[PDB]
């Protein structure tokens, strides 16, 4: 469920959202803290969800790292509300 009172894009065109985005800013959580040059890449699955690849540069490791997730719409795919789980 989205937070109470927030807007959610309601004419979402999932196909135009696919591909690579740069993370300009974030609220800091353990999972992303310290990562630089962070990108998010979305692709469409056959089952109608999205594959998510979050990549960033970890200067402590000196390494690029990525985490892969599966996202599903919680309703209409024209409504930009999804839930993501990471493997």
């Amino acid at each position: 469920t989205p937070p109470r009172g927030v807007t959610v894009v309601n004419n979402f065109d999932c196909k135009r959202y696919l591909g690579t985005w740069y993370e300009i800013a974030r609220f800091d959580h353990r999972f992303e803290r310290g990562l630089e040059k962070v990108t998010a890449t979305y692709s469409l699955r056959d089952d109608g969800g999205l594959n998510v690849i979050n990549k960033g540069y970890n200067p402590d490791r000196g390494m690029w790292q990525q985490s892969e997730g599966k996202a599903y719409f919680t309703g209409a795919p024209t409504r930009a509300a999804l839930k993501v789980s990471f493997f």
């Binding site: 989205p2 740069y22 990562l35 630089e36 040059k37």
Partner: protein, 63 residues
């Protein structure tokens, strides 16, 4: 975890994304840097929707 596009420009070049509560917020761009105009807009929308923008970390990008 919830992933919600709360705001998006008509050209799908800039997005404001939030998680399951107001402690989770991201500015995404098709480009590694954005202009002061786009920054202020995103921040304005964030503040209007009750997000505390003092929580933002500006991620280093080539640029």
């Amino acid at each position: 975890g919830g992933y919600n596009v709360i705001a998006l420009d008509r050209e799908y070049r800039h997005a404001l994304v939030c998680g399951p509560d107001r402690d989770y917020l991201w500015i995404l761009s098709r480009t590694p840097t954005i202009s002061d105009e786009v920054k202020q807009e995103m921040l304005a929308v964030a503040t209007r929707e009750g997000f505390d923008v003092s929580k933002f970390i500006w991620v280093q990008q080539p640029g």
